[PDB]
């Protein structure tokens, strides 16, 4: 009926383990559809039907160019009080785009079905002292859909998007490989599109990284898995100044840059806790749980009256999947 079982001890590479080129999670991976949510209109404009969030012409000129154009641009942007104004469903879409690529499915594979911060989550846990709990489901097409169950960082997190991008949301669906049994078809929201580059541009909004410090390194080894889990994408960071709030500086970065920043000799001298907080650790946590789950999910539905499980992934990295009520749906 219900598992437990221990996770704690499964392969991965030394916490010291550099490598010069990032590695990747997911093979094969690329888009395969894309829609623009229009809220008001509960509507979806599917593919070259939607509206793609684009990035300011000025932004994109001063990625390229590593400046920008002159002063009057520069303090359009730099400066700028990332607080001025702080004083005022995604499951739906998903089953949408199942539904239009099902047909697609590789079936001699298990496709795990996910909104991406799911996915993120699980690959984490070896790396936060807090736990895991979500809900998956077997669907009788014996594939695997995943669900669940500071106000003012967040402000400057949105208020930094609004000032760089030209209600509404956008959504990548992308699908890619895992195992020899094991793809993923995971839903993910772009920030935007860097125009001069086709290529989608993920905006995060921080304080000069005081790296050496967990937060940080947590931070950005999430952000390193966020992208690296879709097929292309860069990113784009506003620091700002940690007193006044206004955004000192705008920097471009690649996944490859992600990944260095934490994945060096260097950095690796000092001695860690979780893992040393390292991508390659992380990618092999992946490979594992995803293996074990998929396993278990699919052994537990043949024995029993519920296609629903609670998943729970302890601090301990201790895996506990019990069957969920076949009389109750998480919307
Ligand atoms: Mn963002």
Redesign the pocket.
Known sequence: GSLVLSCKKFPHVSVNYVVDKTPKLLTDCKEVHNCSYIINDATLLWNEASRKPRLRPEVCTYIKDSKWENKAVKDSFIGIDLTKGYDDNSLVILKEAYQRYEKTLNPEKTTFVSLRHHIIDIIMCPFLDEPLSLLMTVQPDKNILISVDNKKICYT?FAL?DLLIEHELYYSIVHGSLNDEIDLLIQAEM?SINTLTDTYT???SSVHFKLGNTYHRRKLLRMWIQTNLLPKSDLLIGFRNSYSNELEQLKAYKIQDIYHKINNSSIVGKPGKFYKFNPNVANDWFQHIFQVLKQNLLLLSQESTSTTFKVQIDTNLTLSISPASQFVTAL
């Open positions: 997190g998007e920030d993920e905006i995060k």
